[PDB]
Amino acid sequence: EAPRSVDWREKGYVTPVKNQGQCGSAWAFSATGALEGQMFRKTGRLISLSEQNLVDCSGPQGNEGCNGGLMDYAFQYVQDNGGLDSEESYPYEATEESCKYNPKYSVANDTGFVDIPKQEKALMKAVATVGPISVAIDAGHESFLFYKEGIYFEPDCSSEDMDHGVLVVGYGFESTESDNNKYWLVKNSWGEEWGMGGYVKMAKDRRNHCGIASAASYPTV
Amino acid sequence: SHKVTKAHNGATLTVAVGELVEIQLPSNPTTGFAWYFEGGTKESPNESMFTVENKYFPPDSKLLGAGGTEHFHVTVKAAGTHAVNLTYMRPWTGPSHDSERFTVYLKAN
Ligand SMILES: *[C@H]1O[C@H](CO)[C@@H](O[C@@H]2O[C@H](CO)[C@@H](O)[C@H](O)[C@H]2NC(C)=O)[C@H](O)[C@H]1NC(C)=O
Ligand SMILES: [Cl-]
């Protein structure tokens, strides 16, 4: 059913690569990325959203700022809060601070969130049909820190124990490789200087490599 | 028999040749950072002087991006005053003057 390749960057759904810095807030970048994409589908306007707003304000929903969080908790916060400020109005500080949410500058909302079944087939259909998808992966390996190009495959990766929130913006296959040559196109939040301009081609259809299909979701708008 | 944490930055431990020293430091690879010897390696500068093993321990957490811990197991192989010098950095960016550093000296007679 779904296409052989998808890349939502080419459709206008994806803001440039951001940088979480020395702060365990990738969950917030994964959440704003997914929300950026769904707001763009709804309105035709791509507007960068505030990770700091999530970091400072979503404690009641279960998040712990620079000590970690979950995309689903971020999506519930946006719903409970009745809005989310723009990046411009509430810039990123890479530290946990007091909540400064101002409804005057809200540019996004959500009505809930949908969790994808824990299968790469289901993740492929969601990516194809919905837009960019929030996912959790096992990023806790030196090979990931040193990633530069090509399809990332780490033999020691877990499908069950994930620690890092990122964003799947598409999938595809390498012309050059030829056996296990498919990948997920993943936007990270470590700046443009990491990986392929900030992106990693994560191995796809290699038994849910790094747990990419194990905790995937998106906000409903 | 010898454990060391951040609390012991700059200390000297006297050890026997062949004795293991465990270094434990906060580390969060989900932020892109980890601890390294100069040049962005986990290996000893001089294997004949001391050996190093390194392992990351993820936190027990329902959340994504909680900090964990790196352990460095250092074994001294000869008499000397062995400097173990680590820097916390993103390896593709490298260090700066501001980077967090950890040093311990392992002294064997
Ligand atoms: C998203 O959330 C709320 C809830 O719908 C929106 O606020 C309402 O806006 C409508 C239409 O303009 C008004 O009739 C209501 O008075 C508002 N109700 C409120 C404030 O609870 C809000 O405008 C939306 N935010 C964004 C950024 O689109
Ligand atoms: Cl933490």
Ligand code: NA
């Ligand atoms: Na966990």
